[PDB]
Design a protein around this ligand. Structure first.
Ligand SMILES: [Mg+2]
Length: 133
């Protein structure tokens, strides 16, 4: 009951683990924070386990965060997606819009905006868990 799995993907170790640490005290043990170091690790985790919220960097070698998304729009319980990037890139944002991202946060993320996005994402997750009837 109640406990959601949040996957944070970033190819920079300090950004990845820092964000993990931020979310881990924001969750206060109520949720499960996990991390991946790149797009292939994230895809591996996404295919083997329920992820409710996906928080991912966009620019990663070989497989971008947008690439990851296009593999999940092709699946059943696709997670709610927050993208993150150091780049205010309109092309990424436009593609992200077209793929249904919930938030595009810029680095470094203000923990105010980051907590806000995850809460909306956790909420959006419950909304489509109830459409099994
Ligand atoms: Mg990166």
């Amino acid at each position: 009951m109640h406990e959601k799995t949040i996957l944070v993907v970033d190819d920079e170790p300090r950004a990845r683990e820092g964000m993990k640490r931020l979310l881990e005290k924001w969750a206060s043990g109520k949720h499960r924070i996990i991390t991946a170091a790149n797009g292939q690790e994230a895809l591996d985790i996404l295919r083997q386990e329920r992820v409710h919220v996906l928080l991912t960097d966009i620019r990663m070698p070989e497989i971008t965060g947008l690439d990851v998304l296009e593999e999940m729009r092709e699946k059943d319980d696709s997670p709610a997606v927050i993208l993150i990037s150091a780049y205010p890139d309109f092309d990424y944002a436009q593609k992200a819009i077209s793929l249904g991202v919930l938030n595009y946060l810029l680095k470094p993320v203000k923990k105010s905006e980051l907590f806000e996005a995850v809460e909306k994402a956790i909420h959006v997750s419950e909304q489509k868990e109830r459409e099994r009837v």
